[PDB]
Amino acid sequence: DEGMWLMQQLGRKYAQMKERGLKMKEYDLYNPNGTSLKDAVVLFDGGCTGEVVSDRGLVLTNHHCGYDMIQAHSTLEHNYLENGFWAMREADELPNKDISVVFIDKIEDVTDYVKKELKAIKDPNSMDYLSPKYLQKLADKKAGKNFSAKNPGLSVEIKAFYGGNLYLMFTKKTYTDVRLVGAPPSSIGKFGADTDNWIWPRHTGDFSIFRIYADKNGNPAPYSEDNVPLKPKRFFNISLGGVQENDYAMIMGFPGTTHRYFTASEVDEWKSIDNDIRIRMRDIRQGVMLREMLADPQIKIMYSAKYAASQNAYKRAIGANWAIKTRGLRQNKQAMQDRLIAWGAKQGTPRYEEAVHEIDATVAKRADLRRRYWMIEEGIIRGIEFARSPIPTEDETKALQGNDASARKEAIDKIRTRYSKFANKDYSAEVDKKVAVAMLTEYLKEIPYENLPLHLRLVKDRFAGDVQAYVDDIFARSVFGSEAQFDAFAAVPSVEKLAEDPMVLFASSVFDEYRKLYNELRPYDDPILRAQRTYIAGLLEMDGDQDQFPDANLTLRFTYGQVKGYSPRDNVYYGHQTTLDGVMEKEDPDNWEFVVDPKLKAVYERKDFGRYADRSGRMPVAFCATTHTTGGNSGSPVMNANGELIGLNFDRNWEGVGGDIQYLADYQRSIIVDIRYVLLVIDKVGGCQRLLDEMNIVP
Ligand SMILES: NCCNc1ccc([N+](=O)[O-])cc1C(=O)O
């Protein structure tokens, strides 16, 4: 069901949840004045969610959340990323360079306080109401001087909600000694890594295991050999009960952003500029990269990761535009604003209508600037690697005309450093030139001559429209065209060379027009932000916060629904639950994506599933729910009707991407790894029996 609900909204929502099959007492889920399941939830490493699953501070999150730390402890001798990692005692658990988990100790509604401070600001157009500086000073004030010093490990933050109509103060408890305890092999942790990304059905055991270490008193402490595991206020019990179709599921985690209060004009702008330009341009870039990856096995190695990375937001935009096209997103925003305009006329205030009008007019006015911005960002800044070639810094240009000879050698040393980072092991000028020709051709078609970055004018003025010739010249003549050409430059460096270098001119020309469009576009954000405060204020006053959740802003939220499959298209039905048999069907030992660990293979053939199989003796892998999630919900605990852990959220299907603007009851699903599979892989792949023994595993 719809919504990423504030903890303080539990009471307003309990009735709907109780009806969807929730059985816990309210204050056992969230209690502002006592221990609750909320205290088992962490923000893991500043982005992901995790959860505490033992009285000895064991933490579950996704494999993709623990990836960097599993890789940091990976050498070619002991490759943990490949084979997994299973510390057989506490002492073998590996500490991590720059890690955190953050508990949400306390949450207070500080609206009346913040609105009261706000009246001491003269300028009625002040953007301080959404400013991290000002909200943080309002937090320090309300907490005390030397609060971080008085209560060590604790910190405070105020955040805006509902476009500045509601403020919450968070007291955060931060632990910094978080050790790697367990990881499955990446074959399991990343099964179908790229193919099955945003895909249901899904067969990935996307989980890793860490432990929170603290001082003797369980107070936060940086890494010390003398740190001992944290005894936490609360951990999740693990259910073996399983799930069945229409079972109550609920989630707690840290969803990043939503756009629930977009006007119709904003959905049109999202479609017609942001999404259509990203689709057009990444299609061209992806087409040229693919062709060259197929042609040469070395280019494939060099360009595989850059290809995958472009693909990520490419698929998201396709998913997004599909929803605009088919799920009536534009219509439903138009309806919401028309209901409020109508209610506003009768209430005798035009403020709401004046607010929607301000947004519409602002969107219409910025359309050219924004089209140009996206064209240059998708087309050139992301499109063409040689846009990110070295610009001699103001200091560097100076120190080449410098009397002092020590300071020219040092300027050329860090221009060499920056050239080496640009023309790395994975850079091909031949590939970049072909991408650049195709991307620039499309760019020159859409952007008229008078709006071009100054250097791109030369295609028309010097090269008679020949994009190929323009690009060939950039590499022929530039000190960054080849190692040899840079080596010739570095031995006899004049600034008169750099100043006129066609690649430095292209790169600086392009970042100039990028910056300039950013600067002319910035002023248009404020009037929308301010009208949005009024718009949401009206929406709340009209209908209440009951069926109108606050956009996600990287804050702790709960979502609820049922375990339920869906129909993606005519005569096709995806069920609520994948099984290990899905693993075997997709196996292909000659595709890294779909390698099956032999230890799991055997577990399958033996039917060695202990208390973890579904009562038909099938082995669950993943399940999906009508819960409302977005990025930030990676690693989020999935609870049954009694608050027992049944799974671990790890993705969302592509048909639900537009759920960030409008919840999609019959398409959008959270993709969840079954806790029974997690237990299976720990037991039968890792042999890490002490982890089962420290958990409170319930029937
Ligand atoms: N699979 C890469 C991680 N991305 C996500 C993880 C979780 C969720 N979620 O709805 O909870 C969404 C995404 C995402 O890519 O949008």
Residue numbers in the entry: 22 to 720
Q: What text appears in the publication on this structure?
A:
The screening resulted in the first nonpeptidyl inhibitor of S46 peptidases, SH-5 (2-[(2-aminoethyl)amino]-5-nitrobenzoic acid, C9H11N3O4). The binding mode of SH-5 was confirmed by crystal structure analysis at a 2.39 Å resolution. The crystal structure of PgDPP11 complexed with SH-5 (yellow) showed that the carboxy group of SH-5 forms an electrostatic interaction with the side chain of Arg673, a crucial residue for the Asp/Glu specificity of PgDPP1123,27,31. This experimental observation is consistent with the previously obtained in silico docking model based on MM-GBSA scoring (light green). The crystal structure of the SH-5 complex also revealed that the 5-nitro group of SH-5 is involved in a hydrogen bond network with the side chains of Thr650 and Asn670. An amino acid sequence comparison of residues in the S1 subsite of typical S46 peptidases shows that Thr650 and Asn670 in PgDPP11 are well conserved among DPP11s but are replaced by hydrophobic residues, namely, Ile and Ala, respectively, in DPP7s. This result indicates that the hydrogen bond network between Thr650 and Asn670 exists specifically in DPP11s (but not in DPP7s), and the nitro group of SH-5 (and its analog) is also important for the selectivity of this type of inhibitor against DPP11s over DPP7s. For the selectivity, the electrostatic interaction between Arg673 and the carboxy group of SH-5 appears to be more dominant than the hydrogen bond network involving Thr650, Asn670 and the nitro group of SH-5, because Arg673 is replaced by Ser667 in SmDPP11. The Ki vales of SH-5 and the lipophilic analog NPPB against PgDPP11 were estimated to be 8.45 and 15.0 μM, respectively. The target selectivity of the inhibitor, that is the inhibitory effects against DPP11s over DPP7s, is explained by a specific hydrogen bond network and an electrostatic interaction between the inhibitor and the active site residues of PgDPP11 that are conserved among DPP11s but not in DPP7s.
